[PDB]
């Protein structure tokens, strides 16, 4: 894409130790599956393209970007060592939205709907075997 967008977050690195856990399997098969297909998912399914959206200040304000497209790749490509890393990526994505946008903007209402579902699913994250 454009040189004026930053490179996306890392999704592949052979030097980083990887593991499959039952919790990470739940994050892919239950949590991401649930949020990905939601009516309000589409703004979150890829990195924010600040050029196409005409938001030249976006990456001046958001220095820790994350999106569900990146999380999906991280889960599908077994990038994580634990569930906490992935949960943190979801929380970063929601906080980016809340920091950049005004309360009650449509995108914030959309994030809030996804977050409510996320919270319900994380409350049922299974005990690690
Ligand atoms: O200011 C950073 C580069 N940039 C320009 C537009 Br439009 C979007 N990103």
Curated annotation (Swiss-Prot):
It is found in: Nucleus; Chromosome. Ubiquitously expressed. Changing residue 106 to G: Found in a patient with a neurodevelopmental syndrome; uncertain significance. There is a cross-link at residue 60 (Glycyl lysine isopeptide (Lys-Gly) (interchain with G-Cter in SUMO2)). Phosphorylation by CK2 disrupt the intramolecular binding between the bromo domain 2 and the NPS region and promotes binding between the NPS and the BID regions, leading to activate the protein and promote binding to acetylated histones. In absence of phosphorylation, BRD4 does not localize to p53/TP53 target gene promoters, phosphorylation promoting recruitment to p53/TP53 target promoters. Residues 19-125 form the Bromo domain. The record marks 101 as: Acetylated histone binding. JQ1, a thieno-triazolo-1,4-diazepine derivative, and I-BET, a benzodiazepine derivative, have been tested on tumors with success. Treatment with GSK1210151A (I-BET151, a I-BET derivative) has strong effets on mixed lineage leukemia and promotes myeloid differentiation and leukemia stem-cell depletion. Interacts with p53/TP53; the interaction is direct. Interacts (via CTD region) with CDK9 and CCNT1, acting as an associated component of P-TEFb complex. Interacts with RELA (when acetylated at 'Lys-310'). Interacts (via NET domain) with NSD3, CHD4, BICRA and ATAD5. The interaction with BICRA bridges BRD4 to the GBAF complex. Interacts (via NET domain) with JMJD6 (via JmjC and N-terminal domains); the interaction is stronger in presence of ssRNA and recruits JMJD6 on distal enhancers. Interacts with NSD3. Interacts with NIPBL. (Microbial infection) Interacts with bovine papillomavirus type 1 regulatory protein E2. This interactions may serve for the tethering of viral genomes to host mitotic chromosomes allowing successful partitioning of the viral genome during cell division. The NET domain mediates interaction with a number of chromatin proteins involved in transcription regulation (NSD3, JMJD6, CHD4, GLTSCR1 and ATAD5). The C-terminal (CTD) region mediates interaction and recruitment of CDK9 and CCNT1 subunits of the P-TEFb complex. It is also required for maintenance of higher-order chromatin structure. Chromatin reader protein that recognizes and binds acetylated histones and plays a key role in transmission of epigenetic memory across cell divisions and transcription regulation. Remains associated with acetylated chromatin throughout the entire cell cycle and provides epigenetic memory for postmitotic G1 gene transcription by preserving acetylated chromatin status and maintaining high-order chromatin structure. During interphase, plays a key role in regulating the transcription of signal-inducible genes by associating with the P-TEFb complex and recruiting it to promoters. Belongs to the BET family. It is linked to Cornelia de Lange syndrome 6: A form of Cornelia de Lange syndrome, a clinically heterogeneous developmental disorder associated with malformations affecting multiple systems. It is characterized by facial dysmorphisms, abnormal hands and feet, growth delay, cognitive retardation, hirsutism, gastroesophageal dysfunction and cardiac, ophthalmologic and genitourinary anomalies. CDLS6 inheritance is autosomal dominant. This is Bromodomain-containing protein 4. It comes from Homo sapiens (Human).
């Amino acid at each position: 894409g454009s040189h004026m967008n930053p490179p996306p977050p890392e999704t592949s690195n052979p030097n980083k130790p990887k593991r499959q856990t039952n919790q990470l399997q739940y994050l892919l098969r239950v949590v991401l599956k649930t949020l990905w297909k939601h009516q309000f998912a589409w703004p979150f399914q890829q990195p924010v393209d600040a050029v196409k959206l005409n938001l030249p200040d976006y990456y001046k304000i958001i220095k820790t970007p994350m999106d569900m497209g990146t999380i999906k790749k991280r889960l599908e490509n077994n990038y994580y060592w634990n569930a906490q890393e992935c949960i943190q990526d979801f929380n970063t994505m929601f906080t980016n939205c809340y920091i950049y946008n005004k309360p009650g903007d449509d995108i914030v209402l959309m994030a809030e709907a996804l977050e409510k579902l996320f919270l319900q699913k994380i409350n049922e994250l299974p005990t690690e075997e």
